[PDB]
Design a binder for this molecule. Sequence first.
Ligand SMILES: Cc1ncc(COP(=O)(O)O)c(C=O)c1O
Ligand SMILES: Cc1ncc(COP(=O)(O)O)c(C=O)c1O
Lengths: 411, 412
Amino acid sequence: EYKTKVSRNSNMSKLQAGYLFPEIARRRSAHLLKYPDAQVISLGIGDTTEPIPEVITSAMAKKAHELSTIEGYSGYGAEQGAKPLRAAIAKTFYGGLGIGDDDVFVSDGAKCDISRLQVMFGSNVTIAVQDPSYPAYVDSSVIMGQTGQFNTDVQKYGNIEYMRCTPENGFFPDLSTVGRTDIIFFCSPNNPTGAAATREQLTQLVEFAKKNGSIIVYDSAYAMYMSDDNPRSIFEIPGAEEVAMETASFSNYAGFTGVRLGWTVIPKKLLYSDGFPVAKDFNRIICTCFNGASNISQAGALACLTPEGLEAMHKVIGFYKENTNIIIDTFTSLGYDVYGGKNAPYVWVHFPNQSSWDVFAEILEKTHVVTTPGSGFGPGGEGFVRVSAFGHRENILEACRRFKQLYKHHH
Amino acid sequence: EYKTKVSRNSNMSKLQAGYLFPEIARRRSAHLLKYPDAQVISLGIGDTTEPIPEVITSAMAKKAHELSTIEGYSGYGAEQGAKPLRAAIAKTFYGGLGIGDDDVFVSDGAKCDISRLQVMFGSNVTIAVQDPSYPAYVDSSVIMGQTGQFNTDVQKYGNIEYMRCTPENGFFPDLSTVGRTDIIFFCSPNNPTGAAATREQLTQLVEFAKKNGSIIVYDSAYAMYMSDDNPRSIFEIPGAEEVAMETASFSNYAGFTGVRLGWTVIPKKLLYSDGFPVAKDFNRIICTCFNGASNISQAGALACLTPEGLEAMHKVIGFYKENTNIIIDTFTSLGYDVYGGKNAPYVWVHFPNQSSWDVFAEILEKTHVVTTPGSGFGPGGEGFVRVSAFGHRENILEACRRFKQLYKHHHH
Ligand SMILES: Cc1ncc(COP(=O)(O)O)c(C=O)c1O
Ligand SMILES: Cc1ncc(COP(=O)(O)O)c(C=O)c1O
């Protein structure tokens, strides 16, 4: 066979396996070939299942129709997003926190922003992550050349600072043990533990970044699931504006997982060591590497941030929070240590003396329920399994009855 | 003021100015402050102006409504795109060229794919570009670290092979003079020159890439504007499957500039030097750095690839081709050497012995028409201005009447 003379990107070779979620999808597909009539219930990837509220879809349908008219047609939009949407985001989520419309950048989702932020930061920064955490932070770091190879003894990539988060520390790292890095990725409520940092803990985090001259990338994608009285935005901590940016999404709030609409906020006072504003470089990246979120998706997001939109999202969130309680009760009554579920739509279940890939396979084989192995979120995830609360009520109820039946005489 | 201790990305520092199109927007604004009552006509950025066909927007509205129903709701899609859409793309545009559904990757636009491909290739490859060409290829290369500093003497970033395309070489590089690189970005019909490579030229291109062991990134975003009998896909050249990929969009076909939907095709036989298939690394990128094109946008694209969708896109394209003819005739009758226009919805007008930024400024100053200076597309664009044919008919006719009044004493 012919081969080119182009060298494969050595950062791609570093990656230890495929991305977590497609690999779960692969195993689900294999299972369905093995048992074509299996009634599979999917609680692995956190994919929303309930319809998008009509007030939101009507707005998208209306925009689509307007595109067929002379007066309603629009072409390229500003890569930063429509001004009225940036304004609605700024006031709805950051009103009174000193965030301006120009600090908000509308994206086609938070996953995409994590990678565009990483292009911006470039190959020469070092990163810290919660351990466990959402796998995109680590993988985007490897892709951009910020790391060494995967070390199989400790299950870590070289040159990444993995901050230890455990049941024992309430899933917040001991910052006195964490080494200095350029960037700190911090998710609250955290995926997969469900842990939400308190005001005191976030104050420690900002003080730590300030002393270290670090940039916090704060992921608030589950913040509207907060039940405890904790801050929902990093900008609620005075001084955050000098050290932090925030990324979020409509995915988990309006069921926009397939519609594609999120945002990032980068404050005016966030500067590199030469004084250059970080926001200006992010603007260059989005003007060069992106052409804006879909106009229809933007029209949907605008409808979300109205009294009727917020009421509709609140209801959807409430439904999923009810699902979470069902799942919590099931595993608790079976005698497992169960974490999270209070401030997030998933639960983090401890399975001692088994690898989480083995647990995943066993649950899928015996109950036809898809979960997420905890090791997929980093080495501190080993021995845990994440179970999503996103599903139709009847499916959540059925998955729990399957779990109880399997584990009742054994645990 | 407080500053972090994080070093600015040295590749961002390398960039010479802002992206071209935001810079034009800046000058347009400043012009409106100077002339508050001016009736500005924009023939600058290639932004579509006519409504999307109803057959297509109806499909998008229907999908939106379906998302409000139990049965019609869908969440995350395959990051690679809906299978029926990959299948429709593969058959409509590549039927008989040996492209499978699994070789097609649906995106939210060609501009985004170019930068995702650049993340995949990484910082250690070298690139070649047409000179002139669409500025994202160069700028994405600088951002990824593939270049040296900008040299102001020659107006070029170090370590990029700029392949000069001129009236004297028929707007196709003299490949015998082009140095070896890893990647060759090649756009046909070309933006900004409008030139479409012939079957013979593309054959030379594939032969060149094969001998150099290069990967061609073929940009066909204007291929449906083809009037001459020239190939529309690189995969029409036997051997292309070993050295080429293709990136395209619905932007210029259905007015999807704001809707956001494109694709990239990477064939099975395209391998890095260690035998690893390039498509597998692109798949890792789009599964890690992207979460799929919008479901609504995909439903619109699926509706494009039907008898009714194709007829409607044909009509839209035909309207812009007629605008292009109006513009060509105007500059021709004014005594200018005018290029492109035949196979693409823009015209590449020669203004020799002037700086193109100066010509840009003069046209805007006197006629209130925005164009694009050729040097925004690289040093090989110096001496030319690109004029877009995207506009309402009355706006095209009015711009042409203003050009005629501006330039009537230049030639007899
Ligand atoms: C922790 C976390 N970060 C980022 C994302 C990416 O979200 P998006 O759907 O907007 O691309 C997700 C998925 O919802 C997530 O759970
Ligand atoms: C030559 C060329 N390539 C790529 C693009 C990007 O297209 P988009 O992101 O709208 O799909 C354009 C603009 O239409 C272009 O002119």
